[PDB]
């Protein structure tokens, strides 16, 4: 659901001792992993994670692998600098993360560009929606902000986001078309769990759906109910699960309806408890 998107999520973790950091880069198209680079692999290289990426030839993989080797070194220098900014011990365990990417508009142009960093899992510095200014989250990030305002880092990332990001995303959507257009509709059912004090839990399940975007609602006699909702979770086969439950009075279960909204469905599913 929503605009097409591409993201690269990159992480470097320093390791205690003389051991160099672990660097992992994961690429996503429309929230599904499509490429991965891991420095801990026997032969570190970008690998296709979505099989439609095997439409790319050896030159693509070589160029992207060389780029990952450069990014890994940038993260290594950045981790060292951050030790100094926060006055931390040289042989410790620390994490630097980056998120970058683009959302496409109806003109196949950039709709929103994303470029931010975190240190120890907390916001560090981010490029604002204008792709011109920086948000430093803390006092150490002020050092980086001055350095990057002086180096013109924002212009550099704005050019990637408005150009390469958008163009490569369009290429991947064309190559992955046959897979990216596939939807798996949720299969839904309601389960009944008696409680004490004349109450019943009704649980509406949505299973085996793709993409992960979904809405589950409960209504009493057609009126919305504001319900326990678990976080969408992977089934382990590429599809997802979710459930929503309500506590209702015993004997009044038929007055409640669950509704499931998902893009694979020609229309929302409406269902209720079906006693055997």
């Amino acid at each position: 659901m929503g605009p097409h998107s591409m993201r690269y999520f990159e992480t470097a973790v320093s390791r205690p001792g003389l051991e160099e950091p672990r660097y992992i880069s994961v690429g996503y198209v429309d929230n599904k992993e499509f490429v991965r680079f891991d420095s801990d692999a026997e032969n570190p290289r970008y690998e296709p994670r979505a099989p439609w990426m095997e439409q790319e030839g050896p030159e693509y993989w070589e160029r992207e692998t060389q780029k990952a080797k450069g990014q890994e070194q940038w993260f290594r220098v950045s981790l060292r600098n951050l030790l100094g900014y926060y006055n931390q011990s040289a042989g410790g365990s620390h994490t630097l993360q980056q998120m970058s990417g683009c959302d496409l508009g109806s003109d196949w142009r950039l709709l929103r560009g994303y470029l931010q960093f975190a240190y120890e899992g907390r916001d560090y510095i981010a490029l604002n929606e204008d792709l011109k200014t920086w948000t430093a989250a803390d006092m150490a990030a002020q050092i980086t902000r001055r350095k990057w305002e002086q180096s013109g880092a924002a212009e550099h990332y704005k050019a990637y986001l408005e150009g390469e990001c958008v163009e490569w995303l369009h290429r991947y959507l064309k190559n992955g078309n046959a897979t990216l257009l596939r939807t798996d509709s949720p299969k839904a059912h309601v389960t009944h769990h008696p409680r004490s004090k004349g109450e019943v839990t009704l649980r509406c399940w949505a299973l085996g759906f793709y993409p992960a975007d979904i809405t589950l609602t409960w209504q009493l006699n057609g009126e919305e109910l504001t319900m326990e909702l678990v976080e969408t979770r992977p089934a382990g086969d590429g599809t997802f699960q979710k459930w929503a439950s309500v506590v209702v009075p015993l004997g009044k279960e038929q007055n409640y309806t669950c509704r499931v909204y998902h893009e694979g469905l020609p229309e929302p599913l409406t269902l209720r408890w079906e006693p055997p």
């Binding site: 690269y8 990159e10 880069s25 690429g27 992207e64 780029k67 990952a68 450069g70 990014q71 940038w74 220098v77 950045s78 600098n81 951050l82 630097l96 980056q98 970058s100 470029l115 960093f117 560090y124 510095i125 980086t144 350095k147 990057w148 180096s151 880092a153 550099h156 990332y157 990637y160 390469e164 990001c165 490569w168």
Partner: peptide, 10 residues
């Protein structure tokens, strides 16, 4: 195709 963060580190 991922970003190239360039020559200037944090």
């Amino acid at each position: 195709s991922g970003p190239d963060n360039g020559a200037v580190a944090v």
